[PDB]
Design brief:
- By secondary structure, the protein is an all-alpha fold.
- It is 82% helix and 0% strand.
- The longest helix has 29 residues, at 25-53.
- It is elongated.
- The two termini are 22 Å apart.
- The RNAP catalytic core consists of 2 alpha, 1 beta, 1 beta' and 1 omega subunit. When a sigma factor is associated with the core the holoenzyme is formed, which can initiate transcription.
- This is DNA-directed RNA polymerase subunit beta'.
- Belongs to the RNA polymerase beta' chain family.
């Protein structure tokens, strides 16, 4: 819930730059493309550890 809604706000970050010229269409695409990858890590990292810390 946590690390995910963080990505939900971070998307609004990457979008907020898209309107400032900072991020064009292609580089904003890479920032949002990596956002879901980092979240993709933050989740599995949570899974495994969750099992080890609670239900091994």
């Amino acid at each position: 819930q946590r690390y995910l809604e963080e990505a939900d706000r971070k998307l609004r970050q990457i979008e907020q730059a898209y309107e400032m010229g900072f991020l064009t269409d292609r580089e904003r695409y890479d920032q949002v493309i990596q956002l879901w990858t980092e979240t993709t890590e933050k989740v599995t990292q949570a899974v495994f550890k969750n099992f080890e810390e609670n239900y091994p």
